[PDB]
Structure 1
Amino acid sequence: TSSEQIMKTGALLLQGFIQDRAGRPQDASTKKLSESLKRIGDELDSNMELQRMIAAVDTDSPREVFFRVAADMFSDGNFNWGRVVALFYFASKLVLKALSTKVPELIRTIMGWTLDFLRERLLGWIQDQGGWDGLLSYFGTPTW
């Protein structure tokens, strides 16, 4: 049904696309579509225009960066499947940049708190053990 069926398979294709990019039903017809998608997206990695066009853009930035770039990709009123896929590609690039920066920043912030507590509360005690080597002098378990 070329009315609603489009979006159900779009949401499905997109999610499968993103998920793949991040690693580096899904029935019969769907499988074969996903495959071509993967092929087109893989080809896009070598598309120097696309690559330039994304490069000219400061990521981990608001929806205003997305909707503007998405717009320039279709300024000329023309459409094709390569252009549609390149939209997905962009969305994936944005997800991947986010992960690449927001995730290590998450990890760093929490490492921050831990080491903060460790200094203000444990540094002293650890000194008395002879340092971190007291750790191998330990085969017990905490109880509270």
Structure 2
Amino acid sequence: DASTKKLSECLKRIGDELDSNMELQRMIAAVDTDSPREVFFRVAADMFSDGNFNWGRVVALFYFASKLVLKALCTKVPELIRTIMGWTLDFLRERLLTWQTVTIFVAGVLTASLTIWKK
């Protein structure tokens, strides 16, 4: 209980402190112009050059990568959606290859709809 609360506070301090580090933020803002993957690996190599593996070091890398993926996704929603849809559709085509009667019924339904819409 009390210990739980204490831990809660300590961890909150840490998170709030990483996300409100102003200068790291300026760095992160221009972390890389249109080439994030390479920058991430460069930073990774830089930090683990000492040879001292640490879970703490892993967490920071995780944080940086999340930010990168976030900004990229927000800016590439068209691309993302398009590509996902394409994958799904291609699979369906090849793989999808009483059934017949249901197909006929659905066809009729769709036909009527488009006609009414054009009208």
CA distance in 2, matches of 1:124, 1:108: 33
Consecutive unaligned residues in structure 1, runs of 5 or more: 1-26, 126-133
Structure 1 residue 62: Cα displacement: 5.3
CA RMSD, aligned part only? 7.9
Higher relative contact order (CA 8 A, sep 6+): 1
User: Could you say which structure has the higher helix fraction?
Assistant: 2
Structure 1 residue 138: Cα displacement: 15
TM value normalised by structure 1: 0.38
- Residues 61 and 28 from structure 1, CA distance in 2 versus in 1: closer, same or farther, beyond 3 angstroms? farther
Residues 63-90 of structure 1 show CA distances to partners (whole Å, capped at 9, x for unaligned) of 3222012223344555655432211111
Structure 1 residue 94: Cα displacement: 1.2
- Residues 74 and 80 from structure 1, CA distance in 2 versus in 1: closer, same or farther, beyond 3 angstroms? same
Q: Contact (CA 8 Å) 2:44, 2:61: kept in 1 or not?
A: yes
Q: Contact (CA 8 Å) 1:60, 1:97: kept in 2 or not?
A: no
Report SS of the residue matched to 1:37: helix
- Residues 91 and 115 from structure 1, CA distance in 2 versus in 1: closer, same or farther, beyond 3 angstroms? closer
What fraction of aligned residue pairs are identical, expressed as a percent? 92
State the number of aligned residues: 108
